[PDB]
From a paper:
The next unusual PTM reaction on TglA-Cys is performed by a complex formed by TglH and TglI, in which the cysteine β-methylene (β-CH2) of TglA-Cys is removed to generate TglA-CysΔCH2. Like MbnB and MbnC, TglH and TglI of the TglHI holoenzyme likely function as a catalytic and recruitment subunit, respectively, to achieve TglA-Cys modification. Here, we report the structures of TglHI in the absence of Fe ions, with two Fe ions, and with three Fe ions (apoTglHI, TglHI-2Fe and TglHI-3Fe, respectively). The interaction with TglI is required for TglH catalytic activity, indicating that the TglHI complex acts as a holoenzyme for 3-thiaGlu generation, akin to MbnBC.
Residue numbers in the entry:
A (entry chain A): 1 to 269
B (entry chain B): 1 to 295
């Protein structure tokens, strides 16, 4: 019995609720599924007695996994968690529903990928479909998760004498005026929000600091949307999406001066 | 650094697992060492950050006053995945260096890119696992740049395919890897009670007590409870007997007292926190016993 086979065996056991039920109900050798491989059943045969501990170990696994659903939310989407906790959604019922769809997967240190899959799963929850303001808040937090994940191994880009879009900032065009919740977090999920679009910029001051939300003008969002690929500083001022063919100067220079200050763009030099 | 040695004795402290429920109960200047669970200050590995930016503030606030020890749990140290890919070398190794920790301790469990599979899975006591785990322990200690201790594990089911006893496993592990031991006395007591043929006397004589750097004193569940190792109640008297006996045989570098976290550690426990001075009595008794066998 190699140690890796004993670990691989249990790793298969506590991810499939079907295999756990036949183990709990059957203590007899062949009454538990002999469909387990002979090498596997050999390791199951050691647990013939003290099968009570098996149900206790599996129950503690899913208990911690249900709690990790909340820890992943606190890490990635702390404001969405406070909004969901204020409207009283059974996050335990949503944890079990989410984890069973993933076959009780242990994300481990992959907390941002955990939270990203959680926010996507919660975006389709029927309980949350009646709360469009929170659904807008969670998509904002999902961009923050994608901001961190996009900075794990970012594609390096030199100066290249062109306006470049960095990897330390993202933009989110909201559906509701989420700034009312960001400026008054005690009202998260509790108050009502107008359905006006906002351009909130998720940016990191330093690489070892908490991401911050701030609003930018629609013209600054136009400059950020045109810098998806780095532009030649002259084509960018031309690329107002066929609306303007003239350089605005200080009208658009100060906007670019703020974006670089927010670690959102890279000026050409 | 070429050869890691046991540091000079630095004293007794508490584990600071309650990041909030301990600063106000913290008293006087008697305790100048506190343990730090590196998992709580850990940042996600699918992110670019090493430490939680909220945790960087207290490390600044606490590193100046108290020496802060490291504790690696859920780091997947003795797993089957590549050591370079584990959370130990990607997060726990830099965190201990950032904390300026004199040494670091792990756990004798199993983990492969997973956090909550590690408890209730002790390492298979076999010469095959002795060789594999010692090679990882020596390499991991080399990456830490500090002594690496292995905490004795409390478990209800011994891993199948066990060729030897737990004490011989740890003695063969630290002798082949050159690492050290982190003696959790309460884990020995709960293993002596809930396991057939666990010789408590042979356990202490087998272990290279000259390899113990740190000690853990803790309480447990009372008779009749669902399961044990709750780390909540008062430190049992048999655990106090092991603390006085260990200090009369070897010389550790520190001893820490641990308690439960915020949420219920197991399936069903409580949150109450009103017996704050019982901790002071448990610490003070350890302080007196420490000086009774002081260097
Ligand atoms: Fe521990
Ligand atoms: Fe411990």
């Amino acid at each position: 019995m190699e140690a890796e086979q004993v670990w691989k065996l249990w790793r298969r056991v506590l991810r499939d609720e079907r295999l756990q039920a036949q183990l709990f109900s059957a203590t007899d050798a062949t009454h538990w599924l002999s469909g387990f491989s002979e090498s596997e059943s050999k390791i199951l045969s050691v647990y013939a007695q003290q099968f009570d501990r098996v149900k206790w170990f599996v129950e503690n696994y899913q208990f911690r996994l249900v709690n990790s659903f909340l820890n992943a939310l606190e890490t990635g989407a702390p404001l969405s968690l406070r909004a969901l906790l204020h409207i009283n959604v059974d996050l335990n019922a949503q944890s079990k529903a989410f984890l069973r769809d993933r076959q009780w997967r242990d994300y481990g240190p992959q907390v941002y990928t955990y939270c990203e899959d959680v926010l996507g799963f919660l975006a389709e929850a029927d309980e949350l479909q009646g709360y469009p303001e929170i659904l807008d808040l969670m998509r904002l937090e999902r961009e923050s998760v994608r901001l961190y994940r996009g900075l794990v191994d970012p594609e390096s880009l030199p100066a290249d004498n062109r306006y470049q879009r960095t990897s330390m900032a993202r933009l989110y065009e909201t559906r509701f005026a989420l700034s009312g919740w960001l400026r008054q977090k005690d009202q998260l999920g509790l108050t009502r929000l107008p359905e006006s679009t906002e351009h909130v910029l998720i940016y990191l001051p330093t690489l070892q600091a908490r991401h911050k939300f701030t609003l930018i003008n629609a013209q600054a969002a136009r400059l950020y949307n045109c810098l998806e690929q780095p532009q030649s500083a002259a084509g960018l001022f031309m690329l107002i999406n066929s609306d303007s063919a003239s350089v605005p100067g200080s009208a658009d220079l100060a906007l670019l001066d703020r974006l670089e200050q927010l670690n959102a763009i890279r000026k050409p030099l | 650094m070429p050869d890691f040695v046991k540091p000079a004795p630095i004293g007794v402290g508490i584990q600071y697992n309650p990041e909030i429920l301990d600063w106000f109960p913290f008293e006087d200047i008697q305790v100048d060492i506190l343990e730090i669970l590196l998992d709580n200050i850990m940042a996600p590995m699918d992110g670019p950050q090493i430490i939680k930016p909220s945790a960087q503030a207290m490390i600044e606030r606490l590193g100046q006053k108290f020496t802060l020890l490291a504790h690696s749990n859920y780091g997947c140290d003795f797993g089957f995945s590549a050591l370079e890919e584990t959370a130990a070398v990607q997060r726990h190794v830099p965190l201990a260096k950032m904390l300026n920790s004199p040494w670091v301790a792990n756990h004798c469990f199993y983990g492969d890119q997973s956090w909550l599979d590690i408890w209730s899975s002790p390492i298979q006591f076999s010469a095959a696992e002795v060789a594999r785990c010692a090679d990882r322990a020596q390499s991991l200690q080399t990456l830490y740049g500090m002594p690496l201790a292995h905490e004795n594990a409390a478990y209800y089911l011994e891993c199948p395919g066990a060729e030897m006893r737990e004490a011989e496993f740890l003695a063969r592990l630290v002798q082949r890897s050159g690492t050290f031991l982190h003696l959790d006395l309460h884990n020995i007591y709960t293993n002596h009670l809930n396991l057939k043929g666990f010789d408590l006397k042979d356990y202490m004589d087998t272990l290279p007590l000259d390899k113990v750097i740190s000690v853990h004193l803790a309480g447990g569940s009372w008779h009749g409870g669902l399961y044990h190792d709750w780390h909540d109640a008062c430190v049992p008297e048999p655990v106090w007997d092991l603390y006085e006996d260990l200090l009369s045989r070897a010389q550790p570098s520190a001893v820490i007292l641990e308690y439960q976290g915020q949420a219920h550690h197991a399936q069903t426990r409580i949150m109450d926190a009103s017996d704050e001075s019982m901790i002071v009595r448990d610490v003070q008794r350890a302080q007196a016993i420490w000086s009774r066998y002081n260097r």
